[PDB]
Amino acid sequence: GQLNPESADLRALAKHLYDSYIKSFPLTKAKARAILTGKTTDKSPFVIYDMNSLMMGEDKIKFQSKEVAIRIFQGCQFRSVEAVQEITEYAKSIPGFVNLDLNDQVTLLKYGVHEIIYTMLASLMNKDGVLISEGQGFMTREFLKSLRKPFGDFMEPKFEFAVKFNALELDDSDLAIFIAVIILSGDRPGLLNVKPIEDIQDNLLQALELQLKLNHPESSQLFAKLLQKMTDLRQIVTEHVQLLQVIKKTETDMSLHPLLQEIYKDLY
């Protein structure tokens, strides 16, 4: 490795993405971890760990379809509109993106947004639970798993991913480039011009490779491991199709406490 015009351009690209990342996403990883580790003494979230504490935190939970699960997915997708818009604003700042065909821009984003939402959801997660209600609440992992089928299986694979993803200890500077690589995935179905997408991603990959060397001396194969997390992100998205079928094939009672339904609308 040398400091030359090529490497300097890769550092300038990393700074450009990071600055645009800060402008687009007010909920950074640093802010999330500060709440999880109990740093922010002003916003101390309330812990919801069982049905009793669920009722104790009724005030902190702020409020169509027939089935409970479908209304949850409709609600959480509606509450994810702002995040989708933020991701789209971020993609505009990726050099070369807005010059692609508009249909390919839409295709890249319509698949990319789900994976990026899961990436940022991991920031709100530790091994014990997940932040909800805009940092005002903390829903424990085991309480979610204990809920009746099929709800008890909704979030646990995302926790399993988040714990391993968070163990890589990426910061917001890393995540800015990693998210850009996700967006510029040339293997999305329906893409028209794959080559100009791959040309951009190859440059983003080079910037990511250099960023991880400079920022993470403790992990020599971090670049490989981080690209492997793409496969975990896509698997979680594909598991949503199986989830809808489990919901349709469920004959047992799928009634859920209204406060629990509102909490699931804050997840994904």
Binding site: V84, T88, V106, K110
Partner: peptide, 14 residues
Amino acid sequence: SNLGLEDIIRKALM
């Protein structure tokens, strides 16, 4: 929704 998400993305790209 797939077409509902595309509409949100297309409008956001404007």
